[PDB]
Curated annotation (Swiss-Prot), chain B:
Component of the large ribosomal subunit. Mature ribosomes consist of a small (40S) and a large (60S) subunit. The 40S subunit contains about 32 different proteins and 1 molecule of RNA (18S). The 60S subunit contains 45 different proteins and 3 molecules of RNA (25S, 5.8S and 5S). Component of the ribosome, a large ribonucleoprotein complex responsible for the synthesis of proteins in the cell. The small ribosomal subunit (SSU) binds messenger RNAs (mRNAs) and translates the encoded message by selecting cognate aminoacyl-transfer RNA (tRNA) molecules. The large subunit (LSU) contains the ribosomal catalytic site termed the peptidyl transferase center (PTC), which catalyzes the formation of peptide bonds, thereby polymerizing the amino acids delivered by tRNAs into a polypeptide chain. It comes from Candida albicans (strain SC5314 / ATCC MYA-2876) (Yeast). Its main location: cytoplasm. Belongs to the eukaryotic ribosomal protein eL21 family. Disulfide bonds: none annotated. It comes from the Eukaryota. This is Large ribosomal subunit protein eL21. The keyword rRNA-binding does not apply.
Curated annotation (Swiss-Prot), chain C:
Its main location: cytoplasm. SUPFAM superfamilies: RL5-like (SSF55282). GO terms for molecular function: RNA binding; structural constituent of ribosome. Belongs to the universal ribosomal protein uL5 family. It is found in: Cytoplasm. Pfam families: Ribosomal_L5 (PF00281), Ribosomal_L5_C (PF00673). This is Large ribosomal subunit protein uL5. It comes from Candida albicans (strain SC5314 / ATCC MYA-2876) (Yeast). The gene is RPL11. GO terms for cellular component: cytosolic large ribosomal subunit. One of its GO terms (biological process) is translation.
From Swiss-Prot, chain D:
Ribosome preservation factor that protect a small pool of nontranslating, vacant ribosomes in cells under nutrient starvation conditions. Under nutrient-limiting conditions, cells reduce ribosome biogenesis and degrade ribosomes via autophagy (ribophagy) or proteasomal degradation. To avoid excessive degradation during starvation, STM1 binds to and protects 80S ribosomes from proteasomal degradation. Under nutrient-sufficient conditions, TORC1 phosphorylates and inhibits STM1 to prevent formation of dormant 80S ribosomes. It comes from the Eukaryota. It is found in: Cytoplasm. Belongs to the STM1 family. The chain holds residues 22 to 54 of 267 of the full protein. This is Ribosome-associated protein STM1. Associates with mature 80S ribosomes. Binds to the head domain of the 40S ribosomal subunit and prevents mRNA binding by inserting its alpha-helix domain towards the mRNA entry tunnel at the decoding site, where it blocks the binding of tRNA and mRNA at the A- and P-sites. Interacts with eEF2; interaction sequesters eEF2 at the A-site of the ribosome, thereby blocking the interaction sites of the mRNA-tRNA complex, promoting ribosome stabilization and hibernation. It comes from Candida albicans (strain SC5314 / ATCC MYA-2876) (Yeast).
Swiss-Prot record, chain E:
It comes from Candida albicans (strain SC5314 / ATCC MYA-2876) (Yeast). Coiled coil: none annotated. Component of the ribosome, a large ribonucleoprotein complex responsible for the synthesis of proteins in the cell. The small ribosomal subunit (SSU) binds messenger RNAs (mRNAs) and translates the encoded message by selecting cognate aminoacyl-transfer RNA (tRNA) molecules. The large subunit (LSU) contains the ribosomal catalytic site termed the peptidyl transferase center (PTC), which catalyzes the formation of peptide bonds, thereby polymerizing the amino acids delivered by tRNAs into a polypeptide chain. GO terms for molecular function: 5S rRNA binding; structural constituent of ribosome. The lineage of its organism: Eukaryota, Fungi, Dikarya, Ascomycota, Saccharomycotina. It is found in: Cytoplasm. GO terms for cellular component: cytosolic large ribosomal subunit. This is Large ribosomal subunit protein uL18. PANTHER family: LARGE RIBOSOMAL SUBUNIT PROTEIN UL18 (PTHR23410:SF12), RIBOSOMAL PROTEIN L5-RELATED (PTHR23410). Disulfide bonds: none annotated. InterPro entries: Rbsml_uL18_euk (IPR005485), Ribosomal_uL18_C_euk (IPR025607).
Amino acid sequence: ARRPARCYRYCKNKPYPKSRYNRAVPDAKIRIYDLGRKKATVDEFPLCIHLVSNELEQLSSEALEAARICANKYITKVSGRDSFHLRVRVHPFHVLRINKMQGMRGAWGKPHGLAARVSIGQIIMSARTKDSNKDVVIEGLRRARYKFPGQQKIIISKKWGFTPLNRDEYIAKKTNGEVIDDGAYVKFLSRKGNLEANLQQFPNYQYS
Amino acid sequence: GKSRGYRSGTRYAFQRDFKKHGAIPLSTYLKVYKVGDIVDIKANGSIQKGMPHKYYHGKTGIVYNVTKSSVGVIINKVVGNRYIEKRVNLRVEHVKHSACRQEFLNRVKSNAAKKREAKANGETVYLKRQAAKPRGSRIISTEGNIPQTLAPVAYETFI
Amino acid sequence: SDKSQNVMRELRIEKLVLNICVGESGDRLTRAAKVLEQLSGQTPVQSKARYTVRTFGIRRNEKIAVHVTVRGPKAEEILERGLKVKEYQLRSKNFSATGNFGFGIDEHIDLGIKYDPSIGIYGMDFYVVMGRAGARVTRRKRARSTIGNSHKTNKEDTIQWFKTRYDAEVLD
Amino acid sequence: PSAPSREVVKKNTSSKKSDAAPASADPAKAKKK
Amino acid sequence: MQKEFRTSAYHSRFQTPFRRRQEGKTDYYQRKRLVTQHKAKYNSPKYRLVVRFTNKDIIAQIVSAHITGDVVFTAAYAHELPRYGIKYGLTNWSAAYAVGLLVARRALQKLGLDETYTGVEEVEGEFELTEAVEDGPRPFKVFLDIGLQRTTTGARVFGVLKGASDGGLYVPHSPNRFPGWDIEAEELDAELLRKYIFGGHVAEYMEELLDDDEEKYKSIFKNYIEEEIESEDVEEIYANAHEAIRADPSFKPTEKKFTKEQYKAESKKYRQQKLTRAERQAKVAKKIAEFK
RNA sequence: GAGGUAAAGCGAAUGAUUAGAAGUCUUGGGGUUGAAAUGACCUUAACUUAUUCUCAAACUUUAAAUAUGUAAGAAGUCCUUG
RNA sequence: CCUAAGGGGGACUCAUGGAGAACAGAAAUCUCCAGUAGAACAAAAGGGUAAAAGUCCCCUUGAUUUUGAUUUUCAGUGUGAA
RNA sequence: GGUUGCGGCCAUAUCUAGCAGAAAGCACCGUUCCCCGUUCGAUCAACCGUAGUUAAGCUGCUAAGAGCAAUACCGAGUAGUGUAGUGGGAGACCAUACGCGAAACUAUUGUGCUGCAAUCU
């Protein structure tokens, strides 16, 4: 049924999303993007590891599903289902077309599948875990790379978990009462807005 | 098939600016246009009468006629291998004075003003504009500004 | 200054609206209009259905309800007549967040008007719109604006004003 | 007597069932049973 | 349960109306129709007879519009009327007539068309427009501007209109809005217009109220009683004010008890000044400190 | 002067969309309270608030590079009056 | 397709949400508050429009006569339209 | 300097929540014979300026305020891009050379100016 992925590897066409102009589009294979202990707070998983695209390329949704399943299975089998949080950072929004399913007359294709367009340096999957669980997660992502076409790099992030702060400035902000939890993520105090609300929301804030 | 109507392809050009819809400020209706004046053509989407064609949106021309609520504007358009004389009737809402003359008109006054001063002083003065010349020699003092040595930095991943 | 005990901050009735929403048109609506003009002494107005609903049996642009607006001392007189029917006992869930209130009588003859058998009996909605001096600010044509927060009418202020004026009880 | 009628202020020209009128958007009026 | 409406995105995309539209003072549709001049009359200005009524005043200005702002030609205020002999009821229909007559005469005095275009010297309620005089300058042409206030037959704005029309100004108009106009029979009753020109309605009200409600008569017409003005000689007040206006249409400013700088210094005492950035910074620091 | 393409944006409008958090259920169901009170409870799902991941040829506040209109004087500018 | 859905003038503000009123309830009618247009403007889609170009009311036939010029398509011919 | 009338630019002017406002002005405010319009003198119309109030409107000030505006050893000379090579790479794409050069983000600052006429402790 599926053509080989080599037929849809390159970003040759303009983005073709679902809209009010194409409606007979089937759903993407990947439906879950957060796996593992997704409800864990920021502090339990300081280590972040990314799979990063070195290619301007298209990845099919079923390839994303296969890689997600492979990485999840390996990391769960080795270190347990609650030792990590894996997030897929690409969503398939681009509709691929197929023509045959006379000649080149009326050759406009029909929806065939979904793909995500990734750039060079774009993150495909991220995994936040404990430091002691580093070598496991890498090997989990190293296998997921086999489900993708092109070249991908495994990069250990300098930042704390999924936060945009480095591992040293997150500590600097937390020890000053400058950060609170909001479930799986955090909220940072801002020096702008209403003073009373900001002081109430961050009671442990040492003002300078 | 093909559609080539009057306002085809004018989706964004004839739009009002963001947070600038509504009624026209009346300084538009108070400006006085004379024959020979130079005006910038910019179609206003809220007034559909006297609206210019999409080609003339962004063109500058000569006012050749003044009517009750409009002015006649002269535009030169390339059609093939020569220019064709066009005469467009435009309501003053789509017409603004071009600022290119008021800059040049001041230079006419300044050149006249500077020439009479030199004549009154009996000297000669040069009024041609000059392009930016190469800069001349100069001495750089390092007192308080001793050079700092810079080097290319090592590669590092920041994600 | 902004003194609460100012002369112009006194609550008063702006208007009293009487509504009879008979679900059909024709004779019954005309008789309801006759009731309204007998009660208020001024010509009522008929309101058309905004859309067609099969469940209610109404069609768009069909004259369904009839209502009238009374102002001045006549509004006060009719309001106290209606409160006699309600025997001066309203609920806390009769006053809106904007300081107005209202109720509904089931029999219009209880107001003190002569019963007739051609006319029939019709229930009625009384609504009282409360307001202070300076509401014209929000209604005039030139320099129309809003009303300041302290001058606004609210639920609690209307509740205490009603309890003071009519010595009635507001079921909380 | 006079017969005045309330004038039109809304803009809904079509004679169709309006918004905010769905089934099952109501509570159970017979909850006490 | 319902979405909060006043979001930051709501304020970011909000397009505020014009300053004098948000004030609810200038109708820019009508202002565009009035101000805009035929482009072939290049710098010839259109003149507006701006007529505005307050609770205590009538303002009649002759205005020309410009890019930097409107420029006033002449102005007449109802409180100038006591100088001409009208002390009470400065917002009458007849007070409006006197204000219109005064502004028309003052404008023609400023222009220099006094002997020519004297106007309706004998006010008899007849509908009339100022025709041009042959081999002479055309009469001053001004267009009425009533702003946001409604067009009703018998309104006070058309009292100023009639006063200016009888004063020699050429203000195009129709008599179907003057009081005394019959809508069913398309003609104007000159008698009732003349009655409202010389304050007949107020005199009739005093006559009708004096013999019916003595207390309401005393309260409403307290000024007339304290000045010993009966209903019979009210018309003479306006008739003499007309002659006084036509004789001396000049403007006499009120002699100021204080100078401009004295007013400025006295007023500057009762104004709060903006806090320095350091002051509000110190306030924020003190609030943080007192919050432990 | 004009533009709305590249880029960018979505804790900015439209449309698409991942995940939790805290609240309202008073106009969601399930159960456990009651000899009945729709008045509490635990849960799923809905909304709301502050966040979060990813997008748009027929979305956009913003907005290039290149290309494009006009002007750079004697048929001009100024002074007086037919 | 439309004697108005054309023309002029005037008055008003829309979709929606919240809080209230006998029957009346998720949907009738009435009141207030909020409401940058999230409505409507015959018909596709785009643009435009808030004391209006939207809704309603009043009066009307300028949807009239004569013939020229101009714009678009363009040969700078016709037709249509403006 | 305050206020009013008519404005220009059309948020540095808007929005939310509080407080203050001498004089004048404005305003709310009182009445219904008359012109006039309404289901309703609420709006609109007229009369009085007389009986009252700054309660509101209006003006000004406050807010580690929302928005808006401006600036920058902010991001960032980054993204993008014109031109060039018998450059690299299987390709996708990338680097370099001569040029131009963002947006978001970050930080700081600010919160109407002004024209004509009249008027005022």
